[PDB]
């Protein structure tokens, strides 16, 4: 996205009825921090929500 929301008014987008590929995100290596709670980053791609 070109412009992000102010943290006091943080934006939320629902993701549903779609197939994900979290490996594309995690393997991008473009992120300085990537921390997951209660779900493993690698197994995240082998699960449904």
């Amino acid at each position: 996205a070109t412009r992000f929301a102010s943290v006091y008014a943080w934006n939320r987008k629902r993701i549903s009825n779609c197939v994900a590929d979290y490996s594309v995100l995690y393997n991008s290596a473009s992120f300085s921090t990537f921390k997951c709670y209660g779900v493993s980053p690698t197994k995240l791609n082998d699960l449904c929500f």
């Binding site: 393997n27 290596a29 300085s32 980053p41 690698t42």
Partner: protein, 49 residues
């Protein structure tokens, strides 16, 4: 009984991957530590060399 000294150079942001149970381009494809690692990890900035 024995000691093995491993040495390499990586980005400062990648030092956090040199720990047991870590993942990422370095931990996954360059240098993987075992889950029960018993050694020490030492790192320093080498931007002068």
């Amino acid at each position: 009984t024995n000691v093995y000294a491993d040495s390499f150079v990586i980005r400062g942001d990648e030092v956090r991957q040199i720990a047991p149970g870590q993942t990422g381009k370095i931990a996954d494809y360059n240098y993987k530590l075992p889950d029960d690692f018993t050694g020490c990890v030492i790192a320093w900035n080498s931007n002068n060399l």
